[PDB]
Amino acid sequence: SYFEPTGPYLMVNVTGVDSKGNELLSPHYVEFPIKPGTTLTKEKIEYYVEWALDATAYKEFRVVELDPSAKIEVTYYDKNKKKEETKSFPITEKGFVVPDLSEHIKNPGFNLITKVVIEKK
Amino acid sequence: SYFEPTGPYLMVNVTGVDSKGNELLSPHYVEFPIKPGTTLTKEKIEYYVEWALDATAYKEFRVVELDPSAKIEVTYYDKNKKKEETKSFPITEKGFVVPDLSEHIKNPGFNLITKVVIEKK
Q1: Domain boundaries defined on chain A
Q2: If I label B49, which of A81, B9, B40, B82 is the partner at 20 to 30 A Cα–Cα?
Q3: Which CATH number fits domain A1-121: 3.40.190.100, 3.10.20.130, 3.40.50.300, 2.40.50.100?
Q4: Strand (E) or helix (H) holding A28
Q5: Beta strands A96-97 and A39-40: pairing type?
Q6: After what residues is chain A interrupted, C–N > 2.5 A?
């Protein structure tokens, strides 16, 4: 889309590095629409980062591992409290259900800013 | 300096916003040399962010508050473990003493990536 997204979305900002820590790919920005009620698990997230890398020179690379301390975070301004609120969700096999924040913001961006180790298959 | 810094440094990456959350200033990158043994406290850190804003249009603005969840973080590759290690330090009045990581890296960058609320004096 050319315009601001109309609903919740997953914003993937990933830095790709090799197994020795050398940066291969700079923070690459990609948006994916998501809907409240969806369960986001570790495998689904890895699939979104592979999808993200498809727009790069590293489209055929295997994603070895995501930084284990990586979390999905959403920040918004609560209008009724006049305060900024930030929620964080862990990336696990059980996963978490995407909440509906429409009461505060119609197009919340769920952020995944992390480093990923990649390698040739 | 035009070249890569030769010793430890504090890297300030701040986003300035007003009291309603409007972004006034985009992540602004500034480096300050620091030495192991120095105690970095909340007030010293606020002083570094004011110093950082002096390079911007918001040089006369008062820094109202730093995001309370902001931490100072340093990431490096431990050569003997062949693993990346990340250390985080809280921003408090007691503060923390800057460690000497020269065994692993000669010019570690202590990162402060946070949002700060600013206003006219």
Answers
A1: 1-121
A2: A81
A3: 3.10.20.130
A4: strand A23-33
A5: antiparallel
A6: none
Q: CB neighbours of B2 closer than 8 A, spacing ≥ 6? A: none
> What is the experimental resolution, given in Å to one decimal place?
1.8
Min Cα distance B83 → chain A (Å) is 8
Q: How far apart are CA B81 and CA A7, in angstroms?
A: 44
> Is the CB of B68 inside 8 Å of chain A's CB atoms?
no
Inter-chain CB proximity B69 and A86 less than 8 Å: yes
Q: B86 and A69: CB-CB below 8 Å? A: yes
| Spatial CA neighbour of B41 closest among B117, B95, B120, B106 | B95
Please list the alpha-helical segments (H only) found in B4-114.
Answer: 42-53
Helices (H), B4-120: 42-53
A 86-105: CB under 8 A from B = 86
> What does the alpha-carbon distance between residue B23 and residue B27 come to, in Å, rounded to a whole number?
10
b/e map of A69-85 (b: 16 or more CB within 10 Å)? ebebebbbeeeeeeeee
- A86 contact residues in B (CB cutoff 8 A): 69
Say whether residue B80 is in contact with chain A using an 8 A CB cutoff: no
